[PDB]
C-alpha cells in the first residue's frame, strides 16, 4: 500500500517499452503483498494483470486491472547433498543475476540460460530456454498461490506440464501466481554444447577443457553481439514460437522449399526455424514508423521509439499471414498479449 501507485505509466516495466496506463500498479515484495492486492483487486472489481520483469509481454491498451509487480527477493540454497544441489528463489529474483549467483557456488544446470532477461517467477511459464537446455532440464518444484481459493499449492516438475515454451500456467492462464522456485542444480561437471555457435566460439578461445562458468561466459557473448539490446531498441525478444508440424507435412514442405530450416525431433515431428521463414518472406530489416524487424534477428520485431502495442500486433499479423500463405504453417507468438 506505501508503494500503490494509481493511473501510472507502464513504460519502464515492459522491454518492449510501450507506454500505456495501469490502473493500479502494485509492487509486491513477499506474499502478504501478494495477497493485499489480489484483496484489492477485488475490493475495486478489478482484474489482476502479474509481471515480473516486463520482457514477454505486449502491451496494446491501456490495463484496467491492478497490475502486480513481482518484486519478492531472496536466494538460498535449500538442500546441498552429494553433488546434488537444491536451490530456492523467489519470484522477484532477476534471473541472469541468479544465473550468475548459482555459477559463483559452483552449481552447473543453468549456464546455457544465462543473460535471459526476466525473473525467476516468470521462468517456469514459458519454460524458459535457449541454447538446448530448458528450465525443466534442472526444474524441482514450485510453490504457487491460488488465485481461485488463495490457498498455496506446489508444483512438481510432471504437474507443470513443461513443454517447447509452454506450461501448465500458460493453458491455464490467470489462476497460479508463482510465489518461489526451485531448481536442482549440480556440483559435478556438466556441459550442455549441442549448438554448435557455442562449441565453435570455446575452440576459437582454445578452451579444450571447458566449465559450465566458460560456457556461461560464451554464452553471454554471443547473445551479447547478435540480440538487440531492449535499452537501444525496445524488444521482447523472438516474438513468435518455431512451429513443429509432422513428417507429411514436412516433406511437401521440403520438396517445394529444399533449402528449408528444420530440427526434426525425437518423436519424428519437425521443428521449423520460424526465423527462416520469414526472412523467406522478406520480413528482415522491414521497418514501417516506429516498429519493424530486426535486420538479423528475423524473429525479433522492434520499437524504433514511441510504437504503441497496437502497431506492434498489426505488424505480427502481417507476418503470420504471410507465412500461413507462403507455407501453409501458422505462427503462434510467444510474448503473452494484453
Ligand atoms: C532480449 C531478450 C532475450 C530473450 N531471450 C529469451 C530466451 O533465450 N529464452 C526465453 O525463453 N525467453 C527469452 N526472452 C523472453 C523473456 O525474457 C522470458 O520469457 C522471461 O522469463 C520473461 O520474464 P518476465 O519476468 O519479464 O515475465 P513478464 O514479461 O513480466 O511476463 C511473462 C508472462 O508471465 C506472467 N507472469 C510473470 N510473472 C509471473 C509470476 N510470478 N506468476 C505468475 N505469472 C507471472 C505474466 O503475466 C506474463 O503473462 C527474452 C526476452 C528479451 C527481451
Ligand atoms: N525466446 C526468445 O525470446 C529468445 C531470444 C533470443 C534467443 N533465444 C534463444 O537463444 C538461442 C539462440 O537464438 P538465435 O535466435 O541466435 O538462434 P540460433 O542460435 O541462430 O538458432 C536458430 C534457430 O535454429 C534452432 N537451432 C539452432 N541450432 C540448433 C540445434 N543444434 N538443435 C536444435 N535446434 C537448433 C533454434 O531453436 P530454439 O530457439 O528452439 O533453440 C533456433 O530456432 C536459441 O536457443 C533461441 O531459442 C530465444
Ligand atoms: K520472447
Known amino acids: 500500500?506505501?508503494?500503490?501507485?494509481?493511473?501510472?505509466?507502464?513504460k519502464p516495466y515492459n522491454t518492449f517499452g510501450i507506454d500505456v496506463r495501469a490502473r493500479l500498479l502494485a509492487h509486491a515484495r513477499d506474499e502478504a503483498d501478494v495477497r493485499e492486492a489480489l484483496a484489492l483487486a477485488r475490493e475495486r472489481g478489478?482484474?489482476?494483470?502479474?509481471?515480473?520483469?516486463?520482457?514477454?509481454?505486449?502491451?496494446?491498451?491501456?490495463?484496467?486491472?491492478?497490475?502486480?509487480?513481482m518484486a519478492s527477493q531472496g536466494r538460498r540454497i535449500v538442500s546441498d547433498a552429494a553433488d546434488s544441489v537444491?536451490?530456492?528463489?523467489?519470484?522477484?529474483?532477476?534471473?541472469?543475476?541468479?544465473?550468475?549467483?548459482?555459477?559463483?557456488?559452483?552449481?552447473?544446470?543453468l549456464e546455457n540460460l544465462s543473460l535471459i532477461p526476466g525473473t525467476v517467477g516468470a521462468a517456469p511459464?514459458?519454460?524458459?530456454?535457449?541454447?538446448?537446455?530448458?528450465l525443466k532440464d534442472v526444474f524441482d518444484s514450485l510453490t504457487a498461490l491460488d488465485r481461485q481459493d488463495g490457498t498455496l499449492r506446489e508444483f512438481?516438475?510432471?504437474?507443470?506440464?513443461?513443454?517447447?515454451?509452454?506450461?501448465?500456467?500458460?493453458?491455464?492462464?490467470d489462476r497460479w501466481l508463482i510465489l518461489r522456485v526451485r531448481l536442482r542444480l549440480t556440483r559435478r561437471e556438466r556441459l550442455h554444447l549441442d549448438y554448435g555457435p557455442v562449441?565453435?566460439?570455446?575452440?576459437?578461445?582454445?578452451?579444450?577443457?571447458?566449465?559450465?562458468?566458460?560456457?556461461?561466459?560464451?554464452?553471454?557473448a554471443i547473445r551479447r553481439e547478435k540480440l538487440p539490446d531492449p535499452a537501444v531498441l525496445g524488444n521482447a525478444g523472438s516474438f513468435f514460437k518455431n512451429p513443429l508440424v509432422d513428417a507429411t507435412q514436412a516433406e511437401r514442405l521440403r520438396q517445394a522449399f529444399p533449402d528449408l530450416v528444420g530440427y526434426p525431433q525425437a518423436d519424428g515431428r519437425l521443428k521449423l526455424a520460424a526465423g527462416?521463414?520469414?526472412?523467406?518472406?522478406?520480413?528482415?530489416g522491414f521497418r514501417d514508423g516506429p516498429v519493424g524487424v530486426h535486420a538479423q534477428q528475423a524473429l525479433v520485431l522492434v520499437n524504433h521509439g514511441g510504437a504503441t502495442g497496437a502497431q506492434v500486433r498489426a505488424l505480427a499479423e502481417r507476418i503470420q499471414e504471410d507465412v500461413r500463405r507462403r507455407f501453409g504453417v501458422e505462427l503462434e507468438p510467444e510474448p503473452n498479449l494484453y
Not at 125 to 134: F, L
Not at 156 to 173: H, I, T, V, W
Not at 200 to 220: F, H, K, M, N, Y
Open 1 to 10: 500500500s506505501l508503494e500503490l501507485q494509481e493511473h501510472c505509466s507502464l
Open 46 to 69: 478489478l482484474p489482476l494483470l502479474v509481471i515480473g520483469g516486463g520482457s514477454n509481454l505486449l502491451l496494446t491498451r491501456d490495463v484496467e486491472a491492478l497490475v502486480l509487480r
Open 86 to 109: 537444491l536451490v530456492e528463489a523467489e519470484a522477484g529474483e532477476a534471473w541472469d543475476p541468479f544465473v550468475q549467483w548459482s555459477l559463483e557456488r559452483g552449481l552447473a544446470g
Open 125 to 134: 511459464m514459458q519454460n524458459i530456454g535457449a541454447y538446448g537446455v530448458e
Open 156 to 173: 512438481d516438475r510432471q504437474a507443470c506440464r513443461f513443454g517447447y515454451r509452454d506450461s501448465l500456467f500458460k493453458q491455464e492462464p
Open 199 to 220: 562449441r565453435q566460439r570455446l575452440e576459437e578461445e582454445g578452451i579444450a577443457s571447458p566449465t559450465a562458468r566458460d560456457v556461461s561466459r560464451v554464452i553471454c
Open 276 to 284: 527462416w521463414l520469414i526472412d523467406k518472406g522478406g520480413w528482415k
